[PDB]
Amino acid sequence: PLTPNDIHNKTFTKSARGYDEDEVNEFLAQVRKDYEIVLRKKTELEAKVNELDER
Amino acid sequence: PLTPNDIHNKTFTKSARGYDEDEVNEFLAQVRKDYEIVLRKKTELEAKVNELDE
């Protein structure tokens, strides 16, 4: 799946008419934040479960 | 925080020489799916871990 850095690094073509760039970038910053937070929680929990199963 | 639905529902003001809408829409669709799946996996894992000791 996408990484937080993938979201941060994503670029788009500019068209004669398109989505306001500042709005898109701000929204993607927000998505990147929330995604990274949930991803980290998931990976941290997985690591503790793995560690316990491994003993 | 955002929900996956919020990402699907997000609208942007149009502007001259803004980002191509198909490209942004396509990327947001990919992000929406990956975000939905990771949220689901995290929520399921947390629930199940808390069910281990009966």
Curated annotation (Swiss-Prot), chain A:
Transmembrane segments: none annotated. Changing R17 to A/C: Localization at cytoplasmic foci instead of the cell pole. Stable interaction with Spo0J and association with the chromosome. Disruption phenotype: Misplacement of the septum during cell division, resulting in the formation of small, circular, anucleate minicells. It is found in: Cytoplasm. It comes from the Bacteria. Induction: Constitutively expressed. Changing Y19C: No effect on localization. Belongs to the DivIVA family. May act as a pilot protein, directing MinCD to the polar septation sites or by inhibiting MinCD at the midcell site of division. Required for polar localization of the chromosome during sporulation. Oligomers. Interacts with FtsZ, MinD, MinJ and Spo0J. The association with Spo0J is transient and occurs at a specific point during development. Overexpression of DivIVA is lethal. This is Septum site-determining protein DivIVA.
UniProtKB/Swiss-Prot annotation, chain B:
Disulfide bonds: none annotated. This is Septum site-determining protein DivIVA. The gene is divIVA. Oligomers. Interacts with FtsZ, MinD, MinJ and Spo0J. The association with Spo0J is transient and occurs at a specific point during development. Changing Y19C: No effect on localization. May act as a pilot protein, directing MinCD to the polar septation sites or by inhibiting MinCD at the midcell site of division. Required for polar localization of the chromosome during sporulation. Belongs to the DivIVA family. It is found in: Cytoplasm. It comes from the Bacteria. Overexpression of DivIVA is lethal. Induction: Constitutively expressed. The chain holds residues 2 to 55 of 164 of the full protein. Disruption phenotype: Misplacement of the septum during cell division, resulting in the formation of small, circular, anucleate minicells. It comes from Bacillus subtilis (strain 168).
